[PDB]
Amino acid sequence: ASALLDQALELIQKGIHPIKIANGFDEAAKLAISKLEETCDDISASNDELFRDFLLRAAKTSL
Amino acid sequence: NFGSQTPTIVVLKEGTDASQGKGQIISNINACVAVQEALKPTLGPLGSD
């Protein structure tokens, strides 16, 4: 959120209205979510033995 | 007669605001224009908060 705010400081200096700034991130955020939803793969096809390993992948990431 | 001072009787209480002149109703308009200035840029979709 600070990164969006820091980059917005330079655009306020150029004289862009804040609503056009806010609408730009809203269209960009949904566009990025729409792309990342396509590229990620599903893990439900694997059995329970490999599904336990995916939790170990995320468990070691969070700890 | 009961006192050497003889205080002059004020009509209203002490601390009451001023009265008729030039600029009484204009101050009320300027007071409304002051509050109106705060709500001025909040109009329309391209406004502010």
Side-chain angles (χ1 to χ4, degrees):
Chain A
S2 299
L4 272 298
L5 286 166
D6 292 4
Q7 295 291 339
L9 185 138
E10 188 172 6
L11 305 176
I12 290 282
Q13 294 279 27
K14 302 290 177 62
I16 318 190
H17 204 60
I19 307 305
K20 295 184 286 185
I21 297 299
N23 293 21
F25 305 146
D26 299 327
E27 296 291 351
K30 295 190 291 186
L31 186 135
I33 291 157
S34 300
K35 194 186 72 58
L36 201 71
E37 191 175 4
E38 293 177 0
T39 193
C40 64
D41 301 330
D42 186 13
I43 52 153
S44 62
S46 62
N47 67 331
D48 300 329
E49 191 175 3
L50 299 171
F51 181 71
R52 290 288 92 83
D53 301 330
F54 282 101
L55 307 182
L56 291 169
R57 286 191 177 84
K60 295 181 177 180
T61 307
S62 181
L63 266 294
Chain B
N1 189 12
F2 304 153
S4 190
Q5 299 294 347
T6 308
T8 298
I9 295 160
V10 185
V11 179
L12 305 175
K13 308 305 300 303
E14 189 175 3
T16 301
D17 209 331
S19 170
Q20 299 108 318
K22 296 291 185 68
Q24 188 65 65
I25 194 172
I26 305 302
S27 299
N28 298 334
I29 291 157
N30 298 335
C32 297
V33 168
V35 175
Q36 186 253 44
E37 192 67 11
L39 297 165
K40 182 60 65 58
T42 61
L43 184 64
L46 301 170
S48 64
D49 294 354

